[PDB]
Design a protein around this ligand. Sequence first.
Ligand SMILES: Nc1ncnc2c1ncn2[C@@H]1O[C@H](COP(=O)(O)OP(=O)(O)OP(=O)(O)O)[C@@H](O)[C@H]1O
Ligand SMILES: [Mg+2]
Ligand SMILES: [Mg+2]
Ligand SMILES: [Mg+2]
Lengths: 80, 132, 52, 101, 357, 208, 49
Amino acid sequence: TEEDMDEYVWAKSSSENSVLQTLLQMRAAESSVAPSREELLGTKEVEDYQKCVVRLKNEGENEASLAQYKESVKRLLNLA
Amino acid sequence: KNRAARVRVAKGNKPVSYEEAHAPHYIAHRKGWLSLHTGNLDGEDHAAERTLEDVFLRKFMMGTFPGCLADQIVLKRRANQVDICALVLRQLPAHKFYFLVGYSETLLSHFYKCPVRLHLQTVPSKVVYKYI
Amino acid sequence: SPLSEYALRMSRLSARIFGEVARSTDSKSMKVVSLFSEQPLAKKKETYDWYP
Amino acid sequence: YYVDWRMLRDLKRRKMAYEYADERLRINSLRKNTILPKDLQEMAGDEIAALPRDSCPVRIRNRCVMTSRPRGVKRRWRLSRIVFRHLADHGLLSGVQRAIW
Amino acid sequence: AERPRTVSRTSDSDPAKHGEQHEGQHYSIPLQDLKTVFPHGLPPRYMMQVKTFGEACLMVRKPALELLGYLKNTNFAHPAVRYLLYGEKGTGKTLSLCHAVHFCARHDWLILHIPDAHLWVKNCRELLQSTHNKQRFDQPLEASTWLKNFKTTNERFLSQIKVQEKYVWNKRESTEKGSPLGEVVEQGLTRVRNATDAVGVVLKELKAQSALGLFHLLVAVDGVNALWGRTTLKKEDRTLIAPEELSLVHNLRKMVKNDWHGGAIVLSLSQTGSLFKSRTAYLPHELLGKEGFNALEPFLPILIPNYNPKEFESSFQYYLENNWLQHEKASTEEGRKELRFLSNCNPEQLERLCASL
Amino acid sequence: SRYAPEFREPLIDKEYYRKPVAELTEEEKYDQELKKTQFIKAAAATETSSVFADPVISKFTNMMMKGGNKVLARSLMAQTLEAVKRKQFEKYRAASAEEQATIERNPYRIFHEALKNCEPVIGLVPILKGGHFYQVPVPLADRRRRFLAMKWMITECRENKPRRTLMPEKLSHELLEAFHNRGPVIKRKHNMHKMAEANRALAHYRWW
Amino acid sequence: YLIYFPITQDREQLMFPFHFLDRLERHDVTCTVSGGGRSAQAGAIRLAM
Ligand SMILES: Nc1ncnc2c1ncn2[C@@H]1O[C@H](COP(=O)(O)OP(=O)(O)OP(=O)(O)O)[C@@H](O)[C@H]1O
Ligand SMILES: [Mg+2]
Ligand SMILES: [Mg+2]
Ligand SMILES: [Mg+2]
């Protein structure tokens, strides 16, 4: 299970589901036809967000790494 | 008043050796230890057996050399070797000492199953540190 | 936390390699391992050879 | 000759516990568990009781090897406080000194 | 001098006007907004400062300006965004969250403000079981207090919003579909047994109806790390309960999810009052854990730091402006420098040191 | 003591050392030169150059401490001063402009003037003359006069208070009542002085 | 030092060296104190500084 794993693997994790669910709700609000799962998780925005979550989980959590995670969320969620 | 190992004062006519003059609180300060083994060092075993052997070895030498011991013996253990260093008065003939050395070594080597050697330094008479 | 199947099966694989108790044993039944892994008090040279 | 009759009884207790150590271990192991039927454990509870009382290792007392004093003994040297002080205060114990601090 | 005393107050009572120019300036919260927007959620020591000084003034700061910016640009069509205010003890997280609650309250949002969420996982003296689910437990007193405050804050919107379903409180009492949401709140206060269930109806109704565009919804939970942690409550078997079992905790965990739209979620972390957490733990993963972190991600972490040089002088002049620092040597340059060292520019430490002086 | 008699008590006055050389009296100037060839005691953990450190209040804190709990005793004093500042601010705000002038809102100044109101000029020493206990009027030193005021305060609050009241609430209420010469600690001073008048003629028995 | 020394009296002890010479806010100190209690560790740092 995920708990057993010592090194976080974003693939097939709670993070991937939570991100995918949010991105699915975001495209639906845009009125776009339901998109593919691979399409949503292939974007660069999702690529960077994966790297930041992995750093927090594996490299270590600190204000510097949390600042990097803050920027990835802003790009992923299209926040100003 | 403390009485332990203290040779008391009389009228200045009692000879005492250096070992006798010094009370227990001078041990490690002015006078050393008569026995030197590794059994009381930290994390070491067989202290009880080294201490019991010493008690016997001192009674044995007193009886084997009756009236011929000028001072307490010094026991030195190295590896399984035992070394007994005794100051002995020059009372007995020379050949008698050679008999008692051969006897006391062989007997104590077959009793404790270790090599035991006897070292005898002969003094003309007991050495007096002070008259108390 | 609970031990999942992977955790429990790994623990048994470890005990099997290091020669530890592999089953779930009560604290009471772990004394049998203690009794047979330790020299009894009566068999120690300090006890039976206490006296000269 | 040992120091006294009390030291002699202790010596026999120490020599009979050594003979019955394996036996009392094997039997008592059958009782210190929860994996065997209680009928066997109740029967092992009596086999251990039937062994001679001097085999029991809690009847050994540590006495000064030189004076047979039951209390006041130091387990590292097996001597009473009175006998230890005589050897220590004369420089006869290797490395023992008075504690000033 | 008193040059920062000019910087220690601002005339912009309305939270929308505030901007970077207003940083390090204390804006007074109107008296009516204290007894309506903030019947709860303000820190206990700050409440003493509001009573003694006779006026509530909240320093405008860069962390709280960043958050207000996001709330202004909220895309209601998109799913709700969780903003997590994380910082060390005494840095001002609770009052930064109260700043956002004031901005939304003045723009006619529907305030769902949980003042402290640690109070729901400890020191409960009445713990009943739930009819809805027998596994879960009901906290009658904890829910009743929140409802009375939720009523005061959102009294205006309690008549407009109307239930979309029928709720049977008892065999003899039920809520007909279409009735105002105030009736659900009224029954909860009247009958304490249903208080823990009225809350669940309120949270469910507002979450569902918000997406219809009737109102906006600010879910302001301070101390959110309590939800996914451990509890110090024991069952009849003298066995510790878990947060999921509790009714109030279970309902709230849904509100902090981003599966709805039409509002924004503002969260705050507090190690103070936390159970089984170290004294020096403030980071989000340390307090939330693995369960809490996964629940809230993706969230926007907003660091609340210690006072900067401008903010420290503004706070120092505010105390001097109210005669709080009565010691003769406090106004001097050596007093100020000493208080900067002992406090270390931490807002809480400065308030405590000045209290004795 | 681990300090030899040749050690000198440290002087922790910041302004004293930085004064211009000419501003120092030659007596002080001489001591500084002598101290350069002497041993100085290390400063206490609570001895600092802080501008907010008051010896009188620090001493009052140590007389309340139990079992070396300085954190608790200092917390109790910090809570007291705050409870007095908050009690005067309430009165000041709820008072007219004329009344506002008189009201004192400095807790440090209420504490010092409170204690001084409780200090007694004369005390009593118990004496057994001819197998009978008599207490003779004595004139109290500056040290004995100060100790008794602090001791009488810490004892009225510790004992003669309701069970659920707290020391910051009883001590604050007593410092302010002594500050106005109305409290029970002041009444203890009045009784001590009144008894001295009763024993006015029995001071002869003094031998010390 | 605010985190390591939650007690005011310990922080005041660290202030004494710099405050005495009016050198507050002019130096950056990195300390390594091992052994003793809270008060003994602040006092040891005070002398070292
Ligand atoms: N923006 C502010 N305006 C005025 N005072 C402030 C502000 N931020 C912090 N303070 C001061 O700091 C104190 C503590 O603030 P607050 O309770 O918000 O901090 P916190 O970091 O949430 O605390 P905790 O970690 O204990 O939950 C306040 O009572 C006040 O004295
Ligand atoms: Mg006899
Ligand atoms: Mg016994
Ligand atoms: Mg807080």
